[PDB]
Design a protein around this ligand. Structure first.
Ligand SMILES: [Zn+2]
Ligand SMILES: [Zn+2]
Ligand SMILES: [Zn+2]
Ligand SMILES: [Zn+2]
Ligand SMILES: [Zn+2]
Ligand SMILES: [Zn+2]
Length: 89
């Protein structure tokens, strides 16, 4: 479900970065490491929490595309589609 994925990923990134969910959402097209003070350890932790939340496996190599909230949401959606459990509109 698009909305459920967008809110679940926003919640994860807000928790990891210790920022507000609304403010993260406003900065959804912003670059993670340039603008919102993220590390590689924090991106690894986002990836892990997304795996657990949506009950999916995501290969490590995909840390390449954890570069913005929008990119992370797109990653989650594509990985859900590969698992036959995305309902997109
Ligand atoms: Zn819904
Ligand atoms: Zn949307
Ligand atoms: Zn803290
Ligand atoms: Zn808050
Ligand atoms: Zn956009
Ligand atoms: Zn994994």
């Amino acid at each position: 479900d698009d909305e459920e994925i967008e809110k679940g990923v926003t919640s994860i990134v807000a928790e990891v970065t210790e920022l507000d969910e609304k403010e993260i959402w406003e900065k959804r097209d912003a670059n993670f490491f340039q603008d919102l003070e993220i590390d590689s350890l924090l991106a690894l932790e986002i990836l892990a929490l997304i795996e657990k939340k949506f009950k999916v496996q995501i290969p490590e190599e995909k840390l390449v595309d954890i570069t913005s909230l929008s990119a992370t949401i797109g990653l989650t959606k594509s990985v859900l589609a590969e698992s036959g459990k995305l309902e997109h509109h």
